[PDB]
Each structure stands twice: as C-alpha cells, then as structure tokens.
C-alpha cells in the first residue's frame, strides 16, 4: 500500500474503514561537525531544492 | 471586543485563538471541529426501474377476421395474422383453415417493485458546508452547531460567533450525478428521449406517479408456430439490471481528500481543504481584571527533551517567578508550534507539552504578558507509521536556529574586499595622470 | 434528416426556417412561442411575522418576598419590585405597610394569527426555462412544451426536437429575493441575527413547525405604579407591521424585460431575454417526393406596395406558367423581410404578404427550387403609435439598389485620374533626366 504524507483509509472486508498515515521518517543524522547533512534535507521533499543549493 | 481569525479545516487539529487586549488579563480560547457536512442542492429529472412485459391473453377466431384499436398507452403494440389454425387441449379449433386468424397485443407498464428500488438522476450543484464544532473560553466548555454561509451566526454563553463565508467553493462531485439505495455514481445518462434500448435510462418518468412514460425498448411481435396457443415478442431485456451489474465505481471508494459520502440527505463529510475564517464578538464577561490578575516577574524557560513526532511529543518545562499566584495563560507566538492546554495552574514551575514538524523551532513563549525565547534542537522518532493525523498544522520546514543556517553564515567572502582592492589599485594607477 | 436552426426568444413572431433537401420539393417550418418561464431554482433562509405579547397575570404578596425561577421559553425575562399599595374594587389589599412585593414577567410567541399570513426569506440560485412552442408546418400543427436546456428533446409525429442550450442564463433575480402574500422584494435581509430590532425580520424561525423562533424585540419591563393594579411593559412597535409600509417598490415594476412575475411558485415568465438555438432530426416521412409536387418555370414576380408598418406593410403579387397542378412552399433567402403564409395553392396567380424594415426590401424569393429577384421602393407611413408588437424584427437599415447611396456612387469620382496622369505627364521632362 503507497503511504505518503497524506495518509491512506483501506476497507477490507466488513469492518470499518481504518487509516494510516506517515509522520517524517527519513534518517541521516541531521547534525555532525563533519555534517554530511544536505542529505536529510534531502530526505524531505527529495529531488526539489537541492538544485538550489 | 472584536477580533477575526482563520482555522484550518479539518478533525482534529486544536486551534488557538491569543487576542492581545491590552488593560486586562489576556486570553487565548480554544475551538476544535467534530462535522463537516457538504449538502449540495439536488434537482431531479427521471427515475428508472426494471418493467414488466404485460400480455393479455390473445383474441382468436377462425371464420372472419377482426382489427385493433391502438388506445393511449405505453408502446400499443399489436398485428393480426392470416393462417393460424392451432390444436388445443382436445381436437382442435375452428375449421376455417384458410380463415383462421389471431391478433394479439402486449405492452409495457412499471413492475410491481418499481415502487421501492430506482435511480434518481439527480442535476445537483452550489453546495453548502455546516459545521458542529466546540469553543472553549475561560468559564466555557460548550459545543456549538453553526453553518458556514456568511449569514447564520447567533450565539454561546452570551457572546456572539459568526462562521464563513468559505475560502474556496469547491466541490467533491460533479454536475449531473446519480444516485442508488446508499450509493453515488458520478456518470453521465440519457437525456430523457434519447433511451436507446439495452443501456441505462431504457425507459422513465418525471416521478413516480406521471401516468405517462417513454419508451423505447425494440420491442416487437412475430407469428407463432403451429398447433400450440401462445405469443411470441422479442426485445432487448431490461437494462437496469444489466448496469446494476456493471456499476464498477462508486464515489466512497474515489472520492478525493477522503471526505466520505452519506446520503438521504446526498451529503459528503470531513472534507479535509482549505480554511475558515471567523469572526467572534466576545463579551467582557469571560475577561477577568488585571488588577486581580497573577503577577510574575523574571520570566526563562528550558527544555528537558523533544521527540520529532506526530503526537505531542516535546515536554518542556518552564521556570518563572513568583510574586503573587493566580489563573494563568499560555500561547505560541508563531505558526511553527502549538501547545497542548489552554492554561497553567502556576506554582513555582510548570510543564507544558509542545508540538512541532522541523527539528529546530524558536516558539518564543506567550505568558501572561511576559514573553522570552526558549529554542531547542529535536531529532526524529523511531517509528514510522502511526494511525492518528497530524497535530503539527505548521508543517514549516526551514527554521533558521543558527545551527545548521550558521555554516551559511559562515560563508561570508570577503573577497568583496580583495575586489576592492583590484579598483583601488586602479585609482593608484590612475593618479598618475 | 439532422439540421438546426437559431430562433429568437420572442411572443408571438413567426420564425420560418427553410430546408433544401435533395430527392424531395423543398420544405418549410415555422414555430413561434408563448409561455417561456424562466421558473427559477430556490432555497430557505428563515421566515418572520409579528407576535403578541404573552403576558401573565400579576403575583403580589403580604410581607413576603420572590424571585425569577427560570423557563425556558423566548424571551423570559422577570423582575421584583417593592413598595406597593394595590387597591382593588373593594379598596384596600391587605394589612402591611411598606414591605410588600410584586411579581410579573413576559415572554413572547409568534402569535397564532400569523400561521396564514407570513413572509419568507429566500437564497436563490440559477434558472431554467419552459418554452412552449406550435410548429406549424405540413402536418397538422401540433404543440409541444420543453425545458429549454435540459436537452430533454421532446417528440412530435416522428421528429425528435431538442432546444436550447439558452445563453447566460440571464435573470430579474438579485440572490436575497423575500416573498410577500403575492409579491416578490428584492432586499438585503439580516443574517438570521437581529442586531437591530425594529427592523424587517425581527422576528424569526426556521419553518412554520420550529418550537423555537428568535426574538430581539427589545423588551424591558417597568415599575408599577402609585395605588393601582397593572404591569407595565415598554417594548417596540412591531418591525413586521411597520415593514408592510415602506415597501413602495416591488419587483413587479422595476422588472427588465417585462417578466410578469407570479408566486406559487415565483416563475417570471414571457421574457424577451436573447434567443434560442434549436436541431432537429426530421423524420424523412414527411416531405413529398418531387416527382409529384409540380415543377413551375418561365416565372418572374413584381410588387405592388411597400410600407414601413408592423403589423404586414407590403404587398407582391407574382406571375408564373404552370405546367400541373400541385401546391409548393415559399420562403425568402435573407432577413430582410418574413412572409405572413407558408404555401400556396400555386395555380397561375400569387398574393404574398411581407414586412420590409426601414429601405430597400432587396429579395430572393424561393418557389420549389426556383429563385427570383425582387426590388421595391416604399412609401413610409404615417401613425404614430400601435397597440401590438412589430412582425419586421430583422432590423436592417442598409441597400444599393438604385435610389440608395445613388449619389455617393456618382460622387466617388475624379482624384485618380487626374494624379496618375499628371505623374505620367511629369515623367516627359524628368525620365529624359
Ligand atoms: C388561502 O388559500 C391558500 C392556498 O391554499 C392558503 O395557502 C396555504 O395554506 C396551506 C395550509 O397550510 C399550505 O399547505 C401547507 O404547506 C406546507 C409547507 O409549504 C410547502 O408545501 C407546499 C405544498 O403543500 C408548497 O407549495 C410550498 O412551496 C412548500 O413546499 C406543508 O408542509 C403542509 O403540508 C402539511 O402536511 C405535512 C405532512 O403531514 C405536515 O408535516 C405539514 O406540517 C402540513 O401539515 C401544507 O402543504 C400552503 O402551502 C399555503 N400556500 C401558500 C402559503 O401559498 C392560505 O393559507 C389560505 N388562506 C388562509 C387565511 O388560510
Ligand atoms: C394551425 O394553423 C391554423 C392557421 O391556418 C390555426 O388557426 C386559426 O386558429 C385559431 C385557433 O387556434 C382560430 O381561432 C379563433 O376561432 C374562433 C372561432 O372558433 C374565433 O371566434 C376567434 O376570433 C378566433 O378566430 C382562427 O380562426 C384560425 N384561423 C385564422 C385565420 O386565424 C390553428 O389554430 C393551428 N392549429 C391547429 C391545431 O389547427
Ligand atoms: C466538557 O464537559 C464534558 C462534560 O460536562 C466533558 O465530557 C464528555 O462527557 C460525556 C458524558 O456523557 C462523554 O460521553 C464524553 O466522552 C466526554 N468527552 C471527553 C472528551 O472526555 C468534556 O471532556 C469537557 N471538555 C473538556 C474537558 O475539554
């Protein structure tokens, strides 16, 4: 099942309809003196506004 | 007093609502929102049902022949036929066998159930939002049932709240819907006329009581066989049931934002869009004054730990002051973070839980018109899925903290100088002239 | 045979839309309108009428005290006074001085009489027409009755008719309408929340069987007075009976467009709003197979009189050679005028009736596939006013044809004759040079 952000409600069966959504889950380490952290701002929203960096 | 404010529209999400009247104690108050109902207003055109070919029993006779009359009714379908000497249950019939000559009839009238099961084509629009919210100020616990249209607002408690009108008029659905026993479908039907037999809209009425009816359901009559007394007819089978079978989509398995569709009345619920605004004219009442409010003096805060999560997962505890103890008030000064109650008991030092979605926040801190800055690092939880929404509506990324911003900072560049001295050095070749 | 047609939306003007179709005579049809209502949607604010004053009786006491237990009803306010001496008819009350005590109170209903003689609130939203045609052509002329824009696609004797889809939907409508015993207002009514009382809508409830109307009426009670019996009450005048004078402007007058307006439900019908576009798929039954409708030649028409009239100004007569005897339709390839009549019993001879505008009635008259020109200077008339619309509503000031501009095509002229051949006489001296 794709969980982004805004969640997901599935109904299986005869029960009542149940959801399930995604807080922010992205691991680096998000702060070092060797930082290497432009990768966990990469983590949220990937593939946008790194260009800007 | 007056003031506007704005709320996000969906369940769950505690708002908080810090009006800054200067000469008294200040306040902040509290609404959460349990119902939003989107009644859009239905204008039907046509019902359908499955109907029933009803076939008198067929006129006969040898030794002669007859004709018919064709009355006003739905689809009078009727022919004679030359040569039909039959059997029968002993011998036979007429001895005319080159007179023997049947006619027979049948047409086309709603069945029996038609009165309990339909579709309604339903040319709804200019939908409508309410709400069933719960405001709660400083002696006030009490819910609350308003609509959202700029116009209806009375009252709670003896103050007055007004609601709406909306930000955006959007609609889950569309123009020309349809509906069934529980059920919509967003489709498209027969204009009433155009009722080509097999698909849906074969035949229907303006009500259920319009003692006429279209129809156009192929039907035709042949000739029977020898010897046995019935009445052949072909047409295509009622498509109603065909397309009860085939229905393949209903709107509670599509319809966007999850806001989940009811009927009787067509209603559609928890439409998780856009914003509120409101305006409120709140009595003095509720205030209490200054002079008997809580003094506090030499204001700090701190932090013990954050926890990055969905639920309100950053416990703060607050040092201040004391002078003189009271009934007091709490509030964050930005979108970045919100706080869980409404107030304090204040002795000596507080805890409070605060709510964020960035990893770096500098909620400053709102207490009983004394404010001061706290900030606080965070760091992600181990989870990854959970089964509540978020309570963290300022979803704002970028906080500048001077923690991760400050290598930013550090990117200084005094090259802008050593640029300077390239034009410098210009001017002391240019003094030479 | 599928082919459209644009119509306008006026009472009572003969259209006529002529069909060129192969294999068959030539066809025509005309169709006019009466009643086109444009029956609007509607929706419910609240509705308002007056009250009375349901006041009880008075309660006294001999040196004993009371207070205000509350009830729930609208507008329940009490009080107590002291310092009463109430006589009677017998005289004196009781034997205590100056610690005796009253007890009144007043709560208000909407009063019964108003359950026939109410106004009502409305929202309203867009409009749907109901045209009524004649069709008027070889057959027998039947009448058919449509929604304009439900594409509902009525059918008569074998031909499927759709209309509309109508433009803009214009309509005399603001979208605050309220409603009187047989009028309708345009106004700006209090939204549901009376923040002044005597005023239109002081009074309010949600249908006529809520068991809670609002009341602001602004009702304080009083003291009594010296010696008598009484309860003094001081509240205002009725907004509703004192509404029912300032109407003065009802939307039965300032109407556009003349829509007669009607209640039960509000309708506003016979508008000269725009136009119609219509289609039809003519059934191919109808027309005559042109082996059998006479084929007329050797033909040339003249007029006899012209008119800037309304109702049917000029007259042409026609001469042609017949070949068999027959009947044949008739129709003019521009807008310039239209034609009283249909067909003709097309034996030698032939009056026709038409309406020219203002100049020039410029024609191409068609018989049975058989075009001829026709000119005509008028004679312009000479009443003033009438007592019926016009009949000539292609409205077209312009011609050429021999009287008009006549003297502008003469007096173009001159300039280039005279430049071209003075450059090339120029040329004599400077093109040796
Ligand atoms: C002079 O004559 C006129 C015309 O008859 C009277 O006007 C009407 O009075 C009747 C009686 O009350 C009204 O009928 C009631 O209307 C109620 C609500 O209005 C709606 O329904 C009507 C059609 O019935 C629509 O035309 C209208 O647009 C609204 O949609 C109905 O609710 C009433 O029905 C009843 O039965 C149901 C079911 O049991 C109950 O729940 C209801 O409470 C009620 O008992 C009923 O139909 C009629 O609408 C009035 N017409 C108007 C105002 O134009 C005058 O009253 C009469 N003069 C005097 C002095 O009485
Ligand atoms: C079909 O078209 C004809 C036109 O040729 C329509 O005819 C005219 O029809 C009206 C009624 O629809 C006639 O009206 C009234 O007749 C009474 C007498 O019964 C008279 O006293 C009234 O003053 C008025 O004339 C009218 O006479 C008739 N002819 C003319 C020349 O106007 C006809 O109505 C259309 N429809 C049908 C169904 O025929
Ligand atoms: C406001 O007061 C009410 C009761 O006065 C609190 O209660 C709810 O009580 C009803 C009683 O039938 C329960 O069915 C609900 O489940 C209770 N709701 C909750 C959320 O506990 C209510 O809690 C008060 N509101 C506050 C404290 O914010």
Redesign the interface.
Same mark, same amino acid.
């Given at each position: 099942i794709p969980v982004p952000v805004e969640g997901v409600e599935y109904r299986w069966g005869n029960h009542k309809p149940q959801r399930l959504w995604s807080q922010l889950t992205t691991e680096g380490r998000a702060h070092g003196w060797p930082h290497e952290i432009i990768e966990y701002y990469y983590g949220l929203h990937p593939t946008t506004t790194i260009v800007v960096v | 007093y007056e003031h506007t404010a704005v709320i996000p529209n969906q369940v769950g999400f505690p708002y908080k609502a810090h009006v800054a009247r200067e000469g008294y104690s200040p306040l902040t108050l509290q609404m959460q929102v349990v119902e939003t109902s989107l009644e859009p207003?239905l204008?039907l055109?046509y019902i359908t049902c499955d109907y029933k070919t009803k076939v008198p029993s067929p006129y006969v006779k040898c030794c002669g022949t007859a004709e018919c009359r064709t009355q006003d009714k739905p689809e009078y379908k009727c022919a004679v036929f030359t040569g039909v000497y039959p059997f029968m249950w002993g011998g036979a019939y007429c001895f005319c066998d080159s007179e023997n000559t049947q006619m027979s009839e049948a047409y086309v009238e709603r069945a029996d159930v038609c009165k309990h099961d339909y579709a309604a084509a339903y040319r709804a629009?200019?939908a409508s939002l309410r709400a069933k919210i719960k405001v709660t100020y400083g002696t006030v616990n009490q819910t609350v049932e308003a609509y959202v249209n700029?116009?209806?607002?009375?009252?709670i408690a003896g103050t007055?709240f007004i609601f709406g009108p909306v930000s955006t008029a959007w609609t889950p659905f569309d123009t020309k819907i349809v509906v069934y026993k529980g059920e919509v479908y967003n489709q498209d039907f027969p =204009?009433?006329?155009?009722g080509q037999p097999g698909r849906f809209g074969d035949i229907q009425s303006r009500t259920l009581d319009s003692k006429d009816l279209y129809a156009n359901t192929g039907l035709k009559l042949a000739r029977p066989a020898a010897g046995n007394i019935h009445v052949p007819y072909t047409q295509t089978p009622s498509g109603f049931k065909t397309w009860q079978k085939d229905r393949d989509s209903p709107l509670n398995?599509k319809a966007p934002f999850?806001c989940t569709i009811q009927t009787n009345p067509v209603r559609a619920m928890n439409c998780a869009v856009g914003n509120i605004p409101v305006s409120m004219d709140i009595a003095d009442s509720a205030f209490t004054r200054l002079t008997d409010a809580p003094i506090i003096s030499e204001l700090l805060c701190t932090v013990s730990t954050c926890t990055?999560?969905?639920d309100f997962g950053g416990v703060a505890v607050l040092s201040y002051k004391v002078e003189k103890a009271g009934r007091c008030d709490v509030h964050s000064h930005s979108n970045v973070a919100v706080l869980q109650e409404v107030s304090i008991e204040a002795e000596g030092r507080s805890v409070i839980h605060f709510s964020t979605?960035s990893?770096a926040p500098s909620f400053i801190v709102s207490v009983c018109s004394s404010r001061a800055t706290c900030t606080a690092?965070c760091? =992600?939880?181990k989870?990854?899925?959970?089964?509540? =929404?978020?309570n963290h509506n300022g979803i704002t990324?970028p906080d500048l903290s001077s923690?991760?911003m400050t290598?930013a900072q550090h990117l200084a560049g005094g090259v802008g100088l050593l640029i300077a001295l390239a034009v410098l050095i210009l001017v002391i070749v240019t003094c030479i002239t």
């Open positions: - | 207003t204008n055109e629009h200019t700029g116009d209806h607002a009375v009252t007055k =204009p009433y006329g155009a398995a999850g990055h999560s969905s979605a990893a690092k760091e =992600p939880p989870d990854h899925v959970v089964t509540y =929404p978020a990324l923690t991760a290598w």
